Design a protein around this nucleic acid. Structure first.
Ligand SMILES: [Mg+2]
Ligand SMILES: [Mg+2]
Ligand SMILES: [Mg+2]
Ligand SMILES: [Mg+2]
Ligand SMILES: [Mg+2]
Ligand SMILES: [Mg+2]
Ligand SMILES: [Mg+2]
Ligand SMILES: [Mg+2]
Ligand SMILES: [Mg+2]
Ligand SMILES: [Mg+2]
Ligand SMILES: [Mg+2]
Ligand SMILES: [Mg+2]
Ligand SMILES: [Mg+2]
Ligand SMILES: [Mg+2]
Ligand SMILES: [Mg+2]
Ligand SMILES: [Mg+2]
Ligand SMILES: [Mg+2]
Ligand SMILES: [Mg+2]
Ligand SMILES: [Mg+2]
Ligand SMILES: [Mg+2]
Ligand SMILES: [Mg+2]
Ligand SMILES: [Mg+2]
Ligand SMILES: [Mg+2]
Ligand SMILES: [Mg+2]
Ligand SMILES: [Mg+2]
Ligand SMILES: [Mg+2]
Ligand SMILES: [Mg+2]
Ligand SMILES: [Mg+2]
Ligand SMILES: [Mg+2]
Ligand SMILES: [Mg+2]
Ligand SMILES: [Mg+2]
Ligand SMILES: [Mg+2]
Ligand SMILES: [Mg+2]
Ligand SMILES: [Mg+2]
Ligand SMILES: [Mg+2]
Ligand SMILES: [Mg+2]
Ligand SMILES: [Mg+2]
Ligand SMILES: [Mg+2]
Ligand SMILES: [Mg+2]
Ligand SMILES: [Mg+2]
Ligand SMILES: [Mg+2]
Ligand SMILES: [Mg+2]
Ligand SMILES: [Mg+2]
Ligand SMILES: [Mg+2]
Ligand SMILES: [Mg+2]
Ligand SMILES: [Mg+2]
Ligand SMILES: [Mg+2]
Ligand SMILES: [Mg+2]
Ligand SMILES: [Mg+2]
Ligand SMILES: [Mg+2]
Ligand SMILES: [Mg+2]
Ligand SMILES: [Mg+2]
Ligand SMILES: [Mg+2]
Ligand SMILES: [Mg+2]
Ligand SMILES: [Mg+2]
Ligand SMILES: [Mg+2]
Ligand SMILES: [Mg+2]
Ligand SMILES: [Mg+2]
Ligand SMILES: [Mg+2]
Ligand SMILES: [Mg+2]
Ligand SMILES: [Mg+2]
Ligand SMILES: [Mg+2]
Ligand SMILES: [Mg+2]
Ligand SMILES: [Mg+2]
Ligand SMILES: [Mg+2]
Ligand SMILES: [Mg+2]
Ligand SMILES: [Mg+2]
Ligand SMILES: [Mg+2]
Ligand SMILES: [Mg+2]
Ligand SMILES: [Mg+2]
Ligand SMILES: [Mg+2]
Ligand SMILES: [Mg+2]
Ligand SMILES: [Mg+2]
Ligand SMILES: [Mg+2]
Ligand SMILES: [Mg+2]
Ligand SMILES: [Mg+2]
Ligand SMILES: [Mg+2]
Ligand SMILES: [Mg+2]
Ligand SMILES: [Mg+2]
Ligand SMILES: [Mg+2]
Ligand SMILES: [Mg+2]
Ligand SMILES: [Mg+2]
Ligand SMILES: [Mg+2]
Ligand SMILES: [Mg+2]
Ligand SMILES: [Mg+2]
Ligand SMILES: [Mg+2]
Ligand SMILES: [Mg+2]
Ligand SMILES: [Mg+2]
Ligand SMILES: [Mg+2]
Ligand SMILES: [Mg+2]
Ligand SMILES: [Mg+2]
Ligand SMILES: [Mg+2]
Ligand SMILES: [Mg+2]
Ligand SMILES: [Mg+2]
Ligand SMILES: [Mg+2]
Ligand SMILES: [Mg+2]
Ligand SMILES: [Mg+2]
Ligand SMILES: [Mg+2]
Ligand SMILES: [Mg+2]
Ligand SMILES: [Mg+2]
Ligand SMILES: [Mg+2]
Ligand SMILES: [Mg+2]
Ligand SMILES: [Mg+2]
Ligand SMILES: [Mg+2]
Ligand SMILES: [Mg+2]
Ligand SMILES: [Mg+2]
Ligand SMILES: [Mg+2]
Ligand SMILES: [Mg+2]
Ligand SMILES: [Mg+2]
Ligand SMILES: [Mg+2]
Ligand SMILES: [Mg+2]
Ligand SMILES: [Mg+2]
Ligand SMILES: [Mg+2]
Ligand SMILES: [Mg+2]
Ligand SMILES: [Mg+2]
Ligand SMILES: [Mg+2]
Ligand SMILES: [Mg+2]
Ligand SMILES: [Mg+2]
Ligand SMILES: [Mg+2]
Ligand SMILES: [Mg+2]
Ligand SMILES: [Mg+2]
Ligand SMILES: [Mg+2]
Ligand SMILES: [Mg+2]
Lengths: 62, 150, 117, 202
RNA sequence: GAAGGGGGCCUGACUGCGAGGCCUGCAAGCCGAGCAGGGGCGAAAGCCGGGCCUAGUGAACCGGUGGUCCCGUGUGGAAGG
RNA sequence: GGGGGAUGACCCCAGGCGGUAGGGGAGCGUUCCCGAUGCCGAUGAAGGCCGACCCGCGAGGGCGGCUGGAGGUAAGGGAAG
RNA sequence: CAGGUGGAGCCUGGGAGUGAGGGCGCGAGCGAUAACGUCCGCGUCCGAGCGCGGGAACAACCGAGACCGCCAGCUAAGGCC
RNA sequence: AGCUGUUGGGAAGCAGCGCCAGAGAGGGUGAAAGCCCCGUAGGCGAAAGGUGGGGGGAUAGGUGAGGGUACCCGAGUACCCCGUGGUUCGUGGAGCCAUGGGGGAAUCUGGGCGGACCACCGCCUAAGGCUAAGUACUCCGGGUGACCGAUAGCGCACCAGUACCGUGAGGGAAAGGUGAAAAGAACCCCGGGAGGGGAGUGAAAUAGAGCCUGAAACCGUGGGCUUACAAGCAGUCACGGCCCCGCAAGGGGUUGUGGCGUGCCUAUUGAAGCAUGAGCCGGCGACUCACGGUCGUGGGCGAGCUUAAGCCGUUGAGGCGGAGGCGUAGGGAAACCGAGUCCGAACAGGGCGCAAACGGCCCGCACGCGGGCCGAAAAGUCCGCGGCCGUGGACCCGAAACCG
RNA sequence: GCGGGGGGAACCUGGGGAACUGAAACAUCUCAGUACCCAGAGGAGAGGAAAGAGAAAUCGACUCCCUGAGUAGCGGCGAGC
């Protein structure tokens, strides 16, 4: 039957129209951190596959 | 013609990898699954677009954001669909959002916003909204109302 | 539609058992041992083909070396004589020449004995 | 193709028609595929190890009997067991694009026209359906049954007249299909039919 | 020829970014000139986005707390994000 | 691959051509459908048993003889227990 | 920067399989300057070349990369009572 | 609507000259038949029982306006709280519907609801009941099949849920075919019978009832070549002998000696391996299908492409149907803006985005200009085919076990 | 006096109601209100004539198909639903 589009792929990523996938960056609990960590802090264009996985996981339509 | 002469093109009904079957059919014995363990098993593997072997997956280590919705669900607010100028050139007429869907642009439960790309035309253009750019571009050649009702 | 084996397998088997005619015991009568035996006959045939070529030359050589030892020399020298003497026309195949045409061989010996010294 | 013979009592006066100049024998074959597919009954079935009569009992302990190792006798490895992957009821129909059927309809007529095999006729007079009556008009119109004929007309009476001929297949016009055109050596229509045929394409 | 020791003024252990690269299976880790804001020390050139450097650490999820513009299920609020 | 300019199946010339996992490519064959209100068939279907013969690189296809006694089913395409 | 047209190279995509390796040489560690031992490095062969020749016999040592055919020639290793 | 002749055991074959067809579907008949039989197209038919959703008729039932009164408008009910279930809602901001427990109202100015709650604005009138049709199914009858054809198809084509096995629940098979017609072999012979030999029947009797075809393993009789000083994965290459076929040359058979030679599969670094599996032969036996997806490919149409259910229509006739879906714009958590947008104080920078392709002809100084006509291509999208993936038993077979 | 009782392939409603399995372990979650057991109904059964929907001054009983849509949401925010 219809494929089910995994929820949280959908809640963590976005497929940037034409054609690939973009996520946030990674750190959520930190005192002593350079003030880069307001760097990134921004969205991150995931590698590959990692994007072909994802993508194929959320489809019909993205 | 004749039913004997019909036939398809050289692409077109390729047909078909099935083995299985012989040695030096290619594809014999292990039937291309290659010996092995799990993948060659009948249930096969665990869904590669996700499973990583038991480490935490590459998705699912990314954080998430922001608003995912809560329980009574999606909120009812008027949606707009932008259509361009370059797009609506061919129309000499009244150009109402009604008419526009009939063309194959403007979808259905969407309000109209004309915008941007293209050059305007001395046309009456009825719609819900105009961009900064499109209002102007229009105001040079022709002229247009704004739609609010119901 | 369903395509059951029917006639196919009996044919394929018959083909091979036919090839196996004359083979010992089951190797002629059982499609499996027939087929197994045949793999073996197949590679021997191929291999023995290349080696029939060896098997024959090595016969020719013993025969030359035999005949011209009557005339008091090595096959070893004989060929060298014939190499120098320009007489590279070979042989070793002919060698009936040593058997059927003794004198023509003898002449060939002497053309050989006298070359490059 | 363009210039197509009409038969009136008046005369042999000839008609011109739009009718595309290139036929696409692949396209053609595609509609025929489809025609023959959707008409498929798809009634072939078989029983899986699950659907077979016998019990689920394990036939033997599975260690120490010295025999091989087994489940139920409904297992496909058993003579008399389930079938693996054989046929179940299914629907061979698909949906051809409609424009492909128009094109294909048009082209197949075109192909008969391009051969001079297509004929339009007015009014018959081999009506009052009797195959003896038809078989007369047929002769007079140059159809001896040396070539198979597809007869398209809305006249119930002429249709039932030709029906029983071994060399005639017969159709209402609203039922014009390409498979039927291609099977038959010559196409024959009346002008009522040619109209609705023209009103179908385009 | 300071990165060592002493003293004086100081809080750049800034905010908004970041060319281009090191590394690297991914995700991470790393260095970074330069522009803008407002500063510090300096006569200036200049330096300053912690510490001679390489360890002092923990993805996501769930939740806390403070703030803000954002959404608020007929509407205004509010609940909750 | 290069020429020959027949547009190949065709002729020259030069190369390459061990192989498991595996990728790619072309073929053969079995059942069924259209082709079939057809065509082959008791002057003998399918099937069986021989063959040192013909065609194919091969899977196979022919042909001949014997058996058999009522079926078989081209070219070209479709579908699979 | 030059030679190098190669079953070379780069880019995008489709399909894999593999993730038990082994011997030998050389370089180390572990071991006892033991192991057909174990663990890395660089190379090779077996793997997949248990096809051919040499080594009595013998995956991996020497020779050598088997498209088919020949009752033709020259060689390699190793040999010539 | 059909006869004759002909081969033949048999005509329906072949031949001659005919004929019917609203019937050339199909099955029979000694082989292959529109016209011999049974049918088919087209028609027809119920005294009796069933039905009767259609037509008709009856009966039941139904049918007002303004004012005034404030009488009635479903109780252990609503409502609130506790405990739970239902919903996509797993305690969540958790309403709605239901209700085991406790408390427990009102009758239009009454009550419930629009997702905690409050206001406002709406929706609806709970605590009584019934209601065709459109829908599910298939013991049953019928019709069709790119359904099976006796290891298949139901477990059962046959006196099968039987034999048989189990205390029982329960399990559960094998097993079809002489011939056109029994004409099913009188009689004689051997023999206790069985069986066979003659005879006879038959087109045929290695169609003789243990009967169509009659494969293979297996057993046997006869013939040819061969073998008792050789030793081996049984073959192979060479020569020679003997036998056969052929004028010949050539070939088939067999094997004496010589050379060479470590079964098949599987699993492994590595197997002839003293590692797995296989007594042998026949037959059964394992990469499918649906719906999604993703690529490729063959075509259709291209700023568009395409229909789903369903409606009409049909010797296996197709048509209609535009709800919908993908596409045509993106950025942003969102408000929102938009060829941009997001972070930002920034018109710094950066992230993610946006940019018609050809030929050729009309033309603004000339051969491209640029717009534009003509149209080869194409975004895209549709269908087919193929690879792969996702979900499903998802290549087949196999547990120990778990639950009812 | 009238009725009930029991049977029926599947289909239907109602009372009750699992586990293996999935989560590559496992408790919530899944499998699944499935299997199954029980009562009852019929040729169907259920449902049904708004104390509805839910944003439009909107729609009008119920059932069934297509679609909305794998959307809104739900979710050890996992698997998945
Ligand atoms: Mg945070
Ligand atoms: Mg969508
Ligand atoms: Mg093969
Ligand atoms: Mg292959
Ligand atoms: Mg292979
Ligand atoms: Mg594979
Ligand atoms: Mg295996
Ligand atoms: Mg594998
Ligand atoms: Mg392994
Ligand atoms: Mg598995
Ligand atoms: Mg772990
Ligand atoms: Mg976060
Ligand atoms: Mg959302
Ligand atoms: Mg088979
Ligand atoms: Mg040699
Ligand atoms: Mg020489
Ligand atoms: Mg069928
Ligand atoms: Mg079962
Ligand atoms: Mg059991
Ligand atoms: Mg045993
Ligand atoms: Mg069965
Ligand atoms: Mg200081
Ligand atoms: Mg960078
Ligand atoms: Mg500054
Ligand atoms: Mg978790
Ligand atoms: Mg949070
Ligand atoms: Mg801001
Ligand atoms: Mg607000
Ligand atoms: Mg509300
Ligand atoms: Mg509100
Ligand atoms: Mg060559
Ligand atoms: Mg090769
Ligand atoms: Mg006869
Ligand atoms: Mg057949
Ligand atoms: Mg025959
Ligand atoms: Mg056929
Ligand atoms: Mg099979
Ligand atoms: Mg260079
Ligand atoms: Mg390479
Ligand atoms: Mg690749
Ligand atoms: Mg390893
Ligand atoms: Mg290695
Ligand atoms: Mg190693
Ligand atoms: Mg050395
Ligand atoms: Mg070792
Ligand atoms: Mg060692
Ligand atoms: Mg090595
Ligand atoms: Mg291996
Ligand atoms: Mg070797
Ligand atoms: Mg190699
Ligand atoms: Mg060996
Ligand atoms: Mg050796
Ligand atoms: Mg080679
Ligand atoms: Mg030497
Ligand atoms: Mg006669
Ligand atoms: Mg006759
Ligand atoms: Mg004939
Ligand atoms: Mg018949
Ligand atoms: Mg005939
Ligand atoms: Mg007949
Ligand atoms: Mg009748
Ligand atoms: Mg009152
Ligand atoms: Mg309430
Ligand atoms: Mg709940
Ligand atoms: Mg709840
Ligand atoms: Mg929870
Ligand atoms: Mg409320
Ligand atoms: Mg209430
Ligand atoms: Mg409401
Ligand atoms: Mg309401
Ligand atoms: Mg009430
Ligand atoms: Mg009521
Ligand atoms: Mg009812
Ligand atoms: Mg029935
Ligand atoms: Mg069949
Ligand atoms: Mg049987
Ligand atoms: Mg059976
Ligand atoms: Mg049989
Ligand atoms: Mg059975
Ligand atoms: Mg008993
Ligand atoms: Mg007789
Ligand atoms: Mg007899
Ligand atoms: Mg016989
Ligand atoms: Mg017989
Ligand atoms: Mg018979
Ligand atoms: Mg018999
Ligand atoms: Mg004998
Ligand atoms: Mg001796
Ligand atoms: Mg002897
Ligand atoms: Mg012995
Ligand atoms: Mg020998
Ligand atoms: Mg095998
Ligand atoms: Mg093993
Ligand atoms: Mg092992
Ligand atoms: Mg081992
Ligand atoms: Mg042994
Ligand atoms: Mg053992
Ligand atoms: Mg063994
Ligand atoms: Mg083992
Ligand atoms: Mg094995
Ligand atoms: Mg077998
Ligand atoms: Mg698919
Ligand atoms: Mg596909
Ligand atoms: Mg496609
Ligand atoms: Mg119909
Ligand atoms: Mg900017
Ligand atoms: Mg930008
Ligand atoms: Mg940019
Ligand atoms: Mg095009
Ligand atoms: Mg296309
Ligand atoms: Mg009852
Ligand atoms: Mg009852
Ligand atoms: Mg229930
Ligand atoms: Mg459980
Ligand atoms: Mg468990
Ligand atoms: Mg589990
Ligand atoms: Mg598991
Ligand atoms: Mg466990
Ligand atoms: Mg549930
Ligand atoms: Mg009842
Ligand atoms: Mg009812
Ligand atoms: Mg009711
Ligand atoms: Mg559920």
């Amino acid at each position: 039957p219809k494929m089910k589009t995994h929820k949280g792929a959908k809640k963590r990523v976005k497929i940037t129209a034409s054609g690939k996938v973009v996520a946030m960056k990674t750190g959520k609990r930190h005192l002593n951190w350079q003030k880069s960590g307001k760097e990134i802090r921004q969205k991150g264009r995931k590698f590959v596959l990692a994007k072909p996985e994802a993508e194929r996981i959320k489809l019909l339509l993205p | 013609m004749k039913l004997s002469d019909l036939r398809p093109n050289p692409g077109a009904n390729k047909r078909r990898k099935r083995v299985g079957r012989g040695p030096g059919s290619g594809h014999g014995k292990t039937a291309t699954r290659g010996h092995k363990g799990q993948k060659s098993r009948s249930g096969g593997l665990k869904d590669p677009r996700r499973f990583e072997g038991g480490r935490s997956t590459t998705l699912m280590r990314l954080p998430k954001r922001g608003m995912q919705g809560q329980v009574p669900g999606e909120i009812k607010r008027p949606r707009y669909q932008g259509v361009n100028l370059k797009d609506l050139a061919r129309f000499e007429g009244e150009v109402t959002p009604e008419l526009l869907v009939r063309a194959g642009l403007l979808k259905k439960g969407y309000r109209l916003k004309i915008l941007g790309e293209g050059e305007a035309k001395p046309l009456k253009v009825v719609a819900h909204a105009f961009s900064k750019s499109a209002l102007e571009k229009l105001k040079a050649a022709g002229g247009e109302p704004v739609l609010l009702e119901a | 539609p369903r395509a059951k084996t029917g006639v196919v397998r009996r044919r394929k088997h018959k083909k091979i058992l036919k090839l196996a005619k004359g083979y010992w015991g089951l190797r002629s009568k059982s499609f499996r041992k027939a087929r197994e035996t045949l793999f073996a006959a197949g590679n021997y045939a191929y291999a023995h083909r290349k080696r029939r070529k060896r098997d024959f030359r090595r016969l020719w050589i013993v025969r030359i070396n035999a005949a011209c030892r009557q005339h008091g020399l090595n096959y070893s020298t004989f060929i060298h004589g014939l190499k120098k003497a320009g007489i590279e026309v070979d042989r070793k195949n002919l060698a009936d020449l040593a058997v059927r045409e003794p004198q023509v061989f003898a002449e060939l010996v002497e053309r050989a004995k006298a070359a490059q010294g | 193709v363009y210039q197509i013979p009409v038969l009136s009592p008046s005369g042999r006066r000839e008609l011109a028609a739009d009718l595309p100049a290139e036929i696409n024998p692949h396209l053609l074959w595609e509609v025929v595929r489809w025609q023959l597919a959707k008409r498929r009954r798809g009634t072939a079935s078989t029983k899986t190890r699950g659907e077979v009569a016998y019990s689920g009992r394990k036939i033997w302990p599975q260690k120490h009997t010295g025999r091989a190792r087994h489940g139920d006798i409904g297992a496909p490895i058993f003579v008399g067991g389930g079938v693996v992957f054989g046929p179940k009821p299914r629907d061979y129909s698909y949906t051809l694009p409609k424009k492909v059927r128009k094109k294909g309809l048009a082209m197949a007529v075109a192909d008969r026209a391009r051969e001079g095999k297509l004929l339009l006729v007015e009014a018959f007079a081999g009506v009052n359906g009797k195959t003896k009556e038809f078989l007369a008009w047929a002769k007079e119109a140059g159809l001896d049954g040396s070539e198979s004929v597809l007869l398209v007309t809305g006249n119930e009476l002429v249709r039932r007249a030709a029906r029983n001929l071994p060399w005639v297949v017969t159709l209402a016009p609203e039922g014009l299909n390409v498979y039927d055109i291609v099977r038959t050596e010559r196409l024959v229509m009346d002008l009522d039919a040619w109209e609705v045929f023209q009103n179908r394409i385009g």
